[model samples]
Target: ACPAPPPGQPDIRAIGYYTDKAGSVIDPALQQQNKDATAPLDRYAADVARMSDDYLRNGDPAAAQCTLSWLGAWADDGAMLGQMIRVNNDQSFYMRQWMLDAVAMAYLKVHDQANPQQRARIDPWLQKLARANLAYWDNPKRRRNNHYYWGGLGVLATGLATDDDALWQAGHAAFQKGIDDIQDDGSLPLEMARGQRALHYHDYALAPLVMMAELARLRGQDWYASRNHAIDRLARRVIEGSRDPAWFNQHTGAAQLPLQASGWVEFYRLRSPDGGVFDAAHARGPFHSPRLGGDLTLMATHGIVRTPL
Candidate 1:
């Protein structure tokens, strides 16, 4: 079912990664190699994400069953990923985290339909992956940046899926760190240091942070209000930066890249709709990010909203 798990992509190590000293300018050639190398893994995660979103939106039992099958096949393989080999570089780890985030989200959508046997196979696999992510981010050397936030979400989603309280708490700690790291002006210092891509990185960083916040809300925590509503400041900054990058430009001393409507914006807007941010998000909305759980427009409209948006 679901065409046997694709061959395990164990090594996706790329040289020169991407970006200049400011972490803004991209080296297309170098980046392409990384993209090409990770394409298989990306495709697998994207397929799961797409199918999961479809199943959730359409209530198709076939789609739901298919997702569980796909996940089960991969779980049984024990080869879907490298499982935290020491020699792999940061990009490899990032790829794993990205894939884990997407797959974990997909699993959340369809896991309830999984039989006990299926859960026995898949739950441990997901927990192992989440543990790897947690360990990596827990390193003191890892900067508190977007990558950290993404790692947190991956771990948290797995925790939710598998009912692992330790992982859940670790993930929430990461969320708190992110909120605490936001500066008074709502800028992430490390992201702002990224020259021309400051705005882009801001949005990128906000994506996972927003997801983590939403997850916290589901757990009956007020993370969005934590750190004096720091997440709100960051969200507002991103919204403003999208329209006019002058502020980011002045600070970073490089023309900021145009920010796109991200899936996370939909979540933020749903939480706090009494601002121009909602209008801005709506104008360019219906955004979807596979890593943020796919078709966020649909997710915001349907899945997460039981009593409200």
Candidate 2:
């Protein structure tokens, strides 16, 4: 398709892949691999889980704080150089969603009550973002919108906050309605519509759904687990399709960037005994994957912050 790089299209998959939130590529199928991932409550297992338990219950800091120190404080703050678009691109929903995801992830990762100062720094912005999301989905125009990623992130944040249920409601609606938009083979066509660089959207979409699933479980809400097996099975499809691009459509041609099933490599590496980081780095990163600037930062943060424990 784009045998040559499109001018100004400076590798969008880098530190700043998707300007919005992580997309729909959820990986909850297996018991969390004891690898580098942060979801499924099994990845961090004894280490992170123990500390997370303390933070959740007694509100004390977790034991293995250093292990997660890699996340570094103050939000990764990479990828995004603050160089924003002069005119509104079509992905405004995601830009807004990214603001909310940034605040929520930062606030949740820290023990606010213990570190009130840090919490003070992050909580207000997060709350402001939450409110802004409320205004967004409530806008009459969005009713006609097809962007479920927006709905999912809004819902997950609101659900977790317990401040306003509006966001939670929107997120749930987004999942139920928006899920229909995801194809049977597990690739998202929405990003493809954006033009040549849609492959970057794969990883971007997965993170939020993972978070939303966690929020659903925390709230005792009707989360999807073993139903028609949508979420987990869908993730597995990514695993299969990444190995075979024929499963999903492409941007400009039959051959494209997601070749060699690179997108699904994270799941594979997670199962590896060594924990899958270097492999994932080598497989779907830098040279192979078209990381613009933020994808690495985003994926790297996920690698650091998340745990199954």
What are the Cα lDDT values of the candidates?
Answer: 0.78, 0.40
TM-scores for every predicted model: 0.92, 0.50
Superposing all C-alpha atoms, what RMSD in Å does each candidate have to the true structure? 2.5, 13.3
170-220 per-residue lDDT for model 1 (tens digits): 889878888888999998888878988888888888889888887777667
Go through the candidates in order and give the clash count of each: 0, 36
Cα-lDDT of candidate 1: 0.78
- Please give, for residues 138-238, the per-residue lDDT of candidate 2 as tens digits: 66755423345644664465355434565567677666554554566555656545333344445445445544554565566645543454555445544
The CA lDDT at 208 in model 1 is 90
Q: In candidate 2, how many Å is residue 169 off?
A: 2.3
lDDT for 300 in candidate 1 is: 72
